[PDB]
Amino acid sequence: AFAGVLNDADIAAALEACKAADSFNHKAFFAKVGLTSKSADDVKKAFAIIAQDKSGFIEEDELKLFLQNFKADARALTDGETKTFLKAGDSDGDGKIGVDDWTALVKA
Ligand SMILES: [Ca+2]
Numbered sequence: 001a002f003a004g005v006l007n008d009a010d011i012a013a014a015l016e017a018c019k020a021a022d023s024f025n026h027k028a029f030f031a032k033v034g035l036t037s038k039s040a041d042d043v044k045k046a047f048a049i050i051a052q053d054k055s056g057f058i059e060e061d062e063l064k065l066f067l068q069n070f071k072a073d074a075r076a077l078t079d080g081e082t083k084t085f086l087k088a089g090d091s092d093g094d095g096k097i098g099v100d101d102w103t104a105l106v107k108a
Contacts, residue, residue, distance in 0.1 A: 002046050002049055003042075003049065005038055005042040005045055005046055006033055006046070010032065010033050011033055011070050011071070013032055014032040015067060015071055018067070021075070022080055022081060024067070024077055024078075024081045025084070026085050026105065030106050035106055040103050040107065044099055044102075046106075047099045047102040048099070052065075056099065057096035057098045058097040058102075059096050060083070060095070063082045063086055064079075064082050065077075066085070089104075
């Protein structure tokens with residue numbers, strides 16, 4: 001999956017780990033799905049696939065649909081989860097996550 005960067009089994013396990021509302025954590029997910037150990041180049045590919053906006057930036061509203069990039073009928077993140085995700089990843093403060101924010105977040 002994701003241009004071969006992630007394998008189906010890891011993704012399945014990561015989604016099962018966070019089925020419960022408010023059980024998602026970006027760091028836990030990145031680890032389990034196996035992205036954290038990937039090269040920046042692969043990490044950035046994952047970002048480009050995930051980001052829906054031609055602007056190149058992911059808004060909080062879109063983060064809500066985060067798991068649905070991995071499985072179409074996955075749950076939406078809760079507002080608590082998206083708030084947490086956004087605060088951790090928006091290193092520069094513009095309210096969004098760009099590729100730079102994403103790469104730093106994943107690999108930190
Ligand atoms: Ca930002």
